[PDB]
């Protein structure tokens, strides 16, 4: 009883050819992993990626996490990375009253669980999580500071995690809009019981995360397909986390025992991250965890070819939701039609495919709109509007195909599902905003198609 921990989650060790090619490797282990919703990766036991970093100069400041199960949490004092190792390895020595490499890790878990759940109990902890930046850069090597030979191996890898975004085959690479919280990696600096609380990625994409070194990262997953059944449990016993947010930068996350979960039949599994593993995210699989004692991981979010119809579907399921978007899905689309002759012909072949949705889809809006009287229409170049001035009023979805305006409110917009929330003028005065005729499409989807060679 107490806690009974959930089934090992599927662990791959590639060979050297399987390695050379993230993508493709990810595209194979996918019919298994993404019923499992995360695994892990052993690279080749040569793959070695040289870490070097000076624990003085690196400064940060870390997040405060009190640990109650179910308590709401957001989303998103100044430490060096040696005095937080020193407060860290502390900790977890004088929590156990044992040397931190003698806490088994079985234990550290249970220990956790029951934690969380101790009203009692009000341990508080803290994380580092911050952006690839000058003040704090990559675990991995970056071009700049003349690097060893030893680094040079390593710094066009496909697993190097600034690559994995760029690499032509990361539809989340062309995208010339702002998406820094998305497209860059990620630092996680952790200690004893820091830990993430159970979400999903933005806009459904992938997230792949390494463990440079230190203490195991224990990780919970659910597969995408069960995401819904996990929102039905949490929704019941946390409503709160569930009410509407005034923006991004407000999303309610929490600690729940998945034990909880597999009560009520959602599949779960387990992993314990050891420093030189990947984990990996599937599209819409829910994830949460917490670190075993000091350690230090990296982590990035991609989307391959297979996840551009979860990415629309993502899109749509935020309008029923009015949750804010990071990027417009169709600008995206749109971005990469126009870029046909460079694409990757694979690449080209999906974005045709998911560009026809769209055209389809559209096409039945502005019949639509039309017939609710809107008659007066005006080109717009969407993409030069700043997101927040292109947000629709109702759902708060990131226009770029098109929406309606009124002279009445200027410089509000609807998509075109919500034509009726933009105020009470007659449909008439309305302008029907749009970023390219029906005419316009066709060519360009026509390009994508001679790109794929069909
Ligand atoms: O390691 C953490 O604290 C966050 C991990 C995560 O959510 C990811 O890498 O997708
Ligand atoms: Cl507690
Ligand atoms: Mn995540
Ligand atoms: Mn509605
Ligand atoms: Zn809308
Ligand atoms: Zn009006």
């Known amino acids: 009883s107490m806690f009974l921990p959930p089934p090992e989650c599927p662990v791959f060790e590639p060979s050297w050819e399987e390695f050379a090619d993230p993508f493709a490797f990810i595209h194979k282990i996918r019919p298994i992993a993404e019923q499992t919703?995360?695994?892990?990766?052993?690279?080749?036991?040569?793959?070695?990626?040289?870490?070097?970093?000076?624990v003085d100069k690196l400064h940060f400041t870390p997040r405060i996490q009190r640990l109650n199960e179910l308590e709401a949490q957001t989303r998103v004092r100044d430490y060096t990375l040696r005095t937080f190792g020193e407060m860290a390895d502390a900790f977890k020595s004088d929590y156990f009253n044992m040397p931190v490499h003698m806490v088994p890790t079985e234990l550290v878990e249970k220990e956790f669980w029951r934690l969380v759940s101790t009203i009692e109990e009000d341990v508080t902890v803290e994380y580092g999580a911050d952006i690839a930046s000058?003040?704090?850069?990559?675990?991995?090597?970056?071009?700049?500071?003349?690097?060893?030979?030893?680094?040079?191996?390593?710094?066009?890898?496909?697993?190097?995690?600034?690559?994995?975004?760029?690499?032509?085959?990361?539809?989340?690479?062309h995208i010339t809009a702002?998406?820094?919280?998305?497209?860059?990696?990620?630092?996680?600096?952790?200690?004893?019981?820091?830990?993430?609380?159970?979400?999903?990625?933005?806009?459904?994409?992938?997230?792949?995360?390494?463990?440079?070194?230190?203490?195991?990262?224990?990780?919970?997953?659910?597969?995408?397909?069960?995401?819904?059944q996990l929102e039905n449990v949490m929704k019941k016993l946390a409503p709160e986390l569930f009410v509407s947010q005034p923006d991004l930068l407000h999303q309610l996350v929490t600690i729940m025992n998945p034990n909880t979960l597999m009560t009520h039949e959602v599949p779960v599994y387990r992993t314990n991250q050891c420093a030189g593993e990947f984990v990996i995210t599937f599209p819409r699989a829910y994830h949460s965890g917490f670190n075993q004692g000091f350690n230090f991981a990296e982590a990035v979010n991609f989307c391959t070819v297979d996840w551009l119809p979860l990415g629309r579907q993502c899109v749509e399921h935020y309008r029923l939701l009015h949750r804010?978007?990071?990027?417009?899905?169709?600008?995206?689309?749109?971005?990469?039609?126009?870029?046909?002759?460079?694409?990757?012909?694979?690449?080209?072949?999906?974005?045709?495919?998911?560009?026809?949705?769209?055209?389809?889809?559209?096409?039945?809006?502005?019949?639509?709109?039309?017939?609710?009287?809107?008659?007066?229409?005006?080109?717009?170049?969407?993409?030069?509007?700043?997101?927040?001035?292109?947000?629709?009023?109702?759902?708060?979805?990131?226009?770029?195909?098109?929406?309606?305006?009124?002279?009445?409110?200027?410089?509000?917009?609807?998509?075109?599902?919500?034509?009726?929330?933009?105020?009470?003028?007659?449909?008439?005065?309305?302008?029907?905003?749009?970023?390219?005729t029906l005419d316009d499409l066709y060519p360009m989807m026509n390009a994508l198609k001679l790109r794929a060679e069909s």
């Not at 704090?136 to 390593?154: A, C, H, N, Q, T």
């Not at 990696?185 to 390494?210: A, Q």
């Not at 690449?347 to 096409?363: C, G, L, N, P, R």
């Open 134 to 173: 000058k003040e704090f850069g990559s675990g991995f090597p970056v071009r700049d500071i003349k690097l060893s030979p030893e680094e040079e191996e390593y710094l066009d890898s496909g697993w190097n995690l600034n690559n994995m975004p760029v690499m032509e085959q990361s539809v989340l690479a």
């Open 324 to 436: 804010y978007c990071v990027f417009s899905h169709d600008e995206m689309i749109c971005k990469m039609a126009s870029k046909a002759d460079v694409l990757d012909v694979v690449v080209a072949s999906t974005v045709q495919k998911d560009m026809a949705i769209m055209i389809e889809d559209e096409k039945a809006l502005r019949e639509t709109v039309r017939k609710l009287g809107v008659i007066d229409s005006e080109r717009m170049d969407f993409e030069l509007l700043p997101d927040d001035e292109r947000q629709c009023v109702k759902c708060k979805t990131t226009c770029f195909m098109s929406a309606i305006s009124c002279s009445c409110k200027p410089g509000l917009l609807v998509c075109l599902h919500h034509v009726k929330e933009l105020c009470s003028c007659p449909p008439y005065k309305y302008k029907l905003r749009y970023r390219y």
């Open 178 to 228: 702002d998406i820094c919280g998305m497209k860059l990696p990620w630092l996680y600096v952790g200690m004893c019981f820091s830990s993430f609380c159970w979400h999903i990625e933005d806009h459904w994409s992938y997230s792949i995360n390494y463990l440079h070194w230190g203490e195991p990262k224990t990780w919970y997953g659910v597969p995408g397909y069960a995401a819904e």
């Open 37 to 54: 919703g995360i695994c892990k990766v052993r690279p080749p036991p040569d793959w070695q990626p040289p870490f070097a970093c000076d």
